[PDB]
Amino acid sequence: VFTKTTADGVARVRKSKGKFAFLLESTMNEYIEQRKPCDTMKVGGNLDSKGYGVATPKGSALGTPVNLAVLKLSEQGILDKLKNKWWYDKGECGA
Amino acid sequence: KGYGVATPKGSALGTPVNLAVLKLSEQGILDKLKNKWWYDKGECGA
Amino acid sequence: FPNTISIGGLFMRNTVQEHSAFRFAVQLYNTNQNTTEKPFHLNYHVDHLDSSNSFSVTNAFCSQFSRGVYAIFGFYDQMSMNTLTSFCGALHTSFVTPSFPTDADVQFVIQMRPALKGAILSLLSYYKWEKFVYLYDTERGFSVLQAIMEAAVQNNWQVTARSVGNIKDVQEFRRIIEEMDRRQEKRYLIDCEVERINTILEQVVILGKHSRGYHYMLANLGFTDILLERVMHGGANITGFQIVNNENPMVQQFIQRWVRLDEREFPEAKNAPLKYTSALTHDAILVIAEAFRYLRRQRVDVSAGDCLANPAVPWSQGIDIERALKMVQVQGMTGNIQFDTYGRRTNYTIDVYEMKVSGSRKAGYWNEYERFVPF
Amino acid sequence: DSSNSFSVTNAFCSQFSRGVYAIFGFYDQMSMNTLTSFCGALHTSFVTP
Amino acid sequence: IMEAAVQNNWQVTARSVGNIKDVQEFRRIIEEMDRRQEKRYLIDCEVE
Amino acid sequence: IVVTTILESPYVMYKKNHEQLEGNERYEGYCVDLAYEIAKHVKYKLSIVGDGKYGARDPETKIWNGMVGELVYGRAIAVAPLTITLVREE
């Protein structure tokens, strides 16, 4: 049941006629849910909690400015509008 | 949003506390505590 | 064949135990009662060098050459290697030495110290050391450094080489270690002297760079002369190389008869661990005795002037003595002893020791053909 | 030849036996010690650039 | 240079290049110096 | 400033006619926009990681690959879907 690539798992889900379910990261599931032919969906809640971060070398002079910049972008709603832009505004399955 | 464990600036406990939080996250202890105090002690059931 | 052969000895500073082993080995050969084992008497003329004044080194070498010797056992360092090697090669006088093997292919000198190059390369290949920090000094030659560079080029390694020979401040060592840990370097190959290795280990202990996540490969014979207790208690992997086996019956007998010697007559013997250079000295005495016994057996006519003669005519019996010294196959305290045409050891086994918290354990052995058969 | 200490010693001793008041010459990192020691021990000056 | 650096509190990246025979080692040294944003070089080496 | 990223939609993409495009203008996606905003707040040059991996430690040789290895060994900031994990945070 393990697949070599995510695309293989998505194709297996689509061709199994409902007899295969793929376990994958929620972000990529939500992205694939907005792509043609619009025949897959995300069900249930997340099984754990993870976060994507911006990474810098240990001891870098950019670590604190980058952390503060990410925080500013979070409270200005820019992260949310970027995710909306690249997931749903450019989605090809509609709202 | 997120909840964090706060520490004074430049304190020696910041890195150990951050690593401890991450390692509790990997082991599933944080989710276990969340379930224990939200649903195990819940008054409504499933 | 002469009834009494006299050799020369060139001992530099901090060679008290080596001199004691030399005297004890000559005495052991002399006190043998078997006529076949002792067909001649062996004498020695011992001189102490300075290693910083080439004039004094040349004076001692020429005094030994003028008094009349058939071979010259001795030690050299980076400051006295060239003079002794060149004089021995030009005057056709054999130089049996436990010191580091010469980088260049030169004649009339027998370096019976097995090269760590092959063992180090085999251990790097076996341990998957595709990225490590090579801390080296040039006090024992450039063969190991050149071999590491060539192996890195061929195998596409990620060796970061640092020359710590000229470092005189421990803060430089601490800065180097901190910088290397910033890049997540967990493997260190330290090809340095015993004292420099001790200093580096003290610095890694001070910085706490000795937990179970670090591996240190000490590329230096003399694994028993390195202070390793604190690093052992830390839990870091330690790999070392040795040439003397304590379970060898010959070594056991030598130690049994060696720790029962008068301190005032054999200094640094009883209340002192046996250095591998002492074993090399004893095996060199064995090699010289075997070679001259072979020369007597074949009825080879062997039987002095001044160093600086123009033209410098060599005494013709040196070729036969060198050939006899380079064909010996003898079992000594370091195991099998054979030499090639350049006087370097062949068929030598280097014991690889892995050291853990319980103690040092013999992880295996390396040979030129079997290529580090594990245990 | 600086790489051969025997040749350096031969040259220096030939010049010394010939009879000189000073030696002008060059030394490398290998032949510096030999020439310096021989000049300082025989009380003969060595002028070097 | 070392005594002046410890006395005057300098940041000197000391590298011995006298045992280097491959020019790729020089290339790597220059690249890793530039990645640290090093602009000033003191080269005490032979003419070659 | 070298910004290491990984080609994974919708985070980093090639634009449709990136043959005529050059530099950073041949890239599109969430992480390109995020790097632009971060650069405004805090100059750079996107560098798609060569091996195409996120970053992991080899158990045998202890070498970091991917973007984490690009950061550790001084070759690159990493604006990409890189999960925050205990092993990486060290």
Side-chain angles (χ1 to χ4, degrees), chain C residues 83-211 213-224 226-228 230-252 254-263 265-298 300-352:
Chain C
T83 294
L84 300 172
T85 300
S86 308
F87 271 72
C88 282
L91 299 163
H92 286 200
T93 300
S94 296
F95 194 73
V96 190
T97 177
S99 279
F100 58 94
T102 53
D103 292 300
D105 295 332
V106 76
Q107 301 286 120
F108 290 99
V109 55
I110 297 89
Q111 300 96 17
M112 65 179 288
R113 187 194 283 198
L116 276 192
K117 182 187 289 184
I120 290 159
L121 290 178
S122 293
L123 266 295
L124 294 185
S125 296
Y126 175 82
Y127 281 163
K128 299 288 94 175
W129 276 36
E130 297 203 23
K131 180 175 70 69
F132 60 99
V133 182
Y134 178 44
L135 303 182
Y136 69 95
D137 57 20
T138 57
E139 278 209 332
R140 286 158 324 288
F142 303 78
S143 297
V144 182
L145 163 68
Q146 282 159 3
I148 295 299
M149 295 296 172
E150 294 178 354
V153 179
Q154 302 167 349
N155 314 325
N156 290 328
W157 284 347
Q158 276 164 252
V159 194
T160 301
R162 293 269 183 291
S163 161
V164 300
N166 318 126
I167 285 187
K168 294 181 176 67
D169 189 359
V170 300
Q171 303 289 326
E172 292 197 68
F173 285 131
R174 295 181 68 251
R175 283 185 244 121
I176 289 175
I177 299 156
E178 264 162 26
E179 188 210 316
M180 295 296 172
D181 203 8
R182 283 193 269 272
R183 292 228 150 57
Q184 298 296 126
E185 289 277 16
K186 305 295 182 182
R187 281 152 177 193
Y188 296 74
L189 173 60
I190 309 178
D191 172 43
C192 298
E193 294 276 61
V194 174
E195 289 305 339
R196 193 168 318 275
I197 284 179
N198 288 348
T199 312
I200 301 181
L201 293 176
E202 292 179 355
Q203 307 306 318
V204 306
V205 163
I206 286 181
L207 287 176
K209 305 287 180 253
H210 62 104
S211 68
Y214 295 93
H215 194 154
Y216 301 100
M217 185 180 312
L218 311 164
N220 208 285
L221 303 163
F223 192 60
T224 62
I226 308 168
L227 315 173
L228 297 168
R230 319 201 38 180
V231 182
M232 182 179 72
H233 295 312
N237 296 358
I238 292 193
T239 306
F241 309 91
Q242 273 184 70
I243 49 177
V244 183
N245 216 337
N246 292 322
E247 293 83 3
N248 190 318
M250 185 180 288
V251 186
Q252 270 173 11
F254 176 81
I255 296 299
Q256 184 178 2
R257 208 162 29 230
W258 157 265
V259 304
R260 292 183 291 113
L261 283 174
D262 185 73
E263 184 66 25
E265 186 176 2
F266 295 98
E268 184 66 25
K270 184 178 184 293
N271 298 282
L274 182 85
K275 293 187 286 185
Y276 72 109
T277 55
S278 298
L280 297 183
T281 303
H282 176 260
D283 292 11
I285 291 313
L286 285 180
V287 162
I288 281 158
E290 174 59 77
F292 281 96
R293 272 199 313 263
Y294 165 86
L295 277 188
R296 183 179 176 90
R297 250 199 298 286
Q298 304 301 121
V300 181
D301 175 55
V302 295
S303 194
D306 52 352
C307 295
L308 297 154
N310 189 359
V313 63
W315 59 274
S316 56
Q317 293 97 14
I319 301 298
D320 306 355
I321 299 185
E322 192 209 5
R323 186 182 297 113
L325 282 154
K326 289 182 175 180
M327 59 177 42
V328 292
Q329 183 177 1
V330 66
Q331 311 281 144
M333 293 183 48
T334 49
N336 197 229
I337 300 166
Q338 269 166 313
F339 303 101
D340 56 42
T341 186
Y342 293 123
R344 300 207 210 77
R345 296 262 301 247
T346 57
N347 275 334
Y348 56 88
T349 297
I350 288 166
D351 312 295
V352 177

Side-chain angles (χ1 to χ4, degrees), chain F residues 12-15 17-18 21 23-27 29-39 41-42 44 46 48-64:
Chain F
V12 183
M13 293 180 183
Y14 275 121
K15 291 182 181 179
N17 190 359
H18 53 282
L21 301 171
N24 292 353
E25 307 324 301
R26 63 185 178 180
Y27 291 132
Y30 177 92
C31 284
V32 181
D33 294 353
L34 180 61
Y36 174 88
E37 307 277 352
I38 289 170
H41 282 286
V42 193
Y44 55 113
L46 293 197
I48 291 278
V49 61
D51 63 358
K53 293 182 183 293
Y54 287 118
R57 197 185 191 186
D58 195 321
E60 275 193 335
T61 188
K62 274 74 70 177
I63 294 174
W64 286 94

